[PDB]
Ligand binder design. Sequence first.
Ligand SMILES: CCCN(C)S(=O)(=O)c1cc(-c2n[nH]c(=O)n2-c2ccccc2F)c(O)cc1O
Ligand SMILES: CCCN(C)S(=O)(=O)c1cc(-c2n[nH]c(=O)n2-c2ccccc2F)c(O)cc1O
Lengths: 209, 209
Amino acid sequence: EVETFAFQAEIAQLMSLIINTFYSNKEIFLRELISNSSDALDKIRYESLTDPSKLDSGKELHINLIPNKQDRTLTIVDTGIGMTKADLINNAGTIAKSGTKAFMEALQAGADISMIGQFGVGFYSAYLVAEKVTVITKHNDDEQYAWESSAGGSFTVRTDTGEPMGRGTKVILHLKEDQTEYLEERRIKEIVKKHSQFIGYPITLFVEK
Amino acid sequence: EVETFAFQAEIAQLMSLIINTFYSNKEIFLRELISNSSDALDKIRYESLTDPSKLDSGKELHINLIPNKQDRTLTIVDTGIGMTKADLINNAGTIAKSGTKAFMEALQAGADISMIGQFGVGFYSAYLVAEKVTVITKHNDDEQYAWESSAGGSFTVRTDTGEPMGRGTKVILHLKEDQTEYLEERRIKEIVKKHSQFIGYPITLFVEK
Ligand SMILES: CCCN(C)S(=O)(=O)c1cc(-c2n[nH]c(=O)n2-c2ccccc2F)c(O)cc1O
Ligand SMILES: CCCN(C)S(=O)(=O)c1cc(-c2n[nH]c(=O)n2-c2ccccc2F)c(O)cc1O
């Protein structure tokens, strides 16, 4: 059973701006997703202090970067707190609305796209490099869900029938044809070293066979 | 009834470094506390989506900057989620430990003190300008508490007997003798405009009588 939702107009407007604006510094999407993974890892780690059973779904706190040249996908995996079904829908809600409006106002006032994270809408920078984003997530208090959007004003949410992940979030970036540099080991390493050098969790870049 | 706690050694070491290192760019403490206020405001705002009764303790989501030249205090007030007694004690816990160690390692490797926030220990930059920090906080699920530390390896936690605050956190920076520039309106405005221009909550600088 697949549910389709409309993005609110300001978010749909933001997504179309990110897709259609000429902006060469596209590498910033990686920093934004890694930052969000690190925030989700902080959340589970903090909850696990007062309640250690929160880690029964997995004690390992890490980030994996998995490029796949055959599928043309860059997957970002984390074992953070994950997202509930309500969380997925709310990522296109009120906080995202005020943040989107403030960011687009800042862009009009001369700010640049790399400042997206300061408005809490950093996720949408995935659309600088991806024609489609698939998010697989599992929170301790809910089932495993698959969120997906190719922009165009909508996203879908379905219960995931795939392999269980224990806990966390998997971001599958279905890369645009001209954005395959983000599948190269040396390029990924360069971006991680430049923007995410101080992340408090092991970031593992997977090698392809 | 006042409870006294020891900071763990790495945090006590960090605090002594912040107090004794020659570092002229002290203004960064304001950005760190405002950033933490904004994060606490995001948390209550997000919780209020699925549960509107979370805002019965106050619907207003803001940050107030209150300098007081007579008391030599700069107070930062927010109506964020606030902190429980467990939260106050855990601010000197495991997450703070790994973050402190990583930050001090980065400093050895040539990083500078302004990067403190990337390690989640941004609060401790208050000790660049304050000889003592008093924190008054109220979370919906707990009583009102007063946290206090003049560094020296310890902090205290007591139930606050003062005026109720509804919900949020009040940071009272008892400024060092040579740090009174942070009580001047034009100086505060300059720092807010430079470092916190994109905060998603109204920041009000109070004028003195
Ligand atoms: C529908 C899009 C979801 N994303 C891919 S995301 O928001 O970039 C993103 C979200 C999470 C996430 N899991 N749990 C959680 O609380 N978060 C979270 C963290 C920071 C900010 C907002 C958030 F919800 C993550 O681990 C990685 C991500 O790349
Ligand atoms: C003992 C020191 C407490 N501080 C003064 S603080 O951490 O800088 C600080 C904390 C809060 C706070 N309230 N609720 C909450 O979750 N937080 C929080 C936000 C971000 C990071 C860690 C945190 F706990 C705040 O609103 C303002 C602050 O200046």
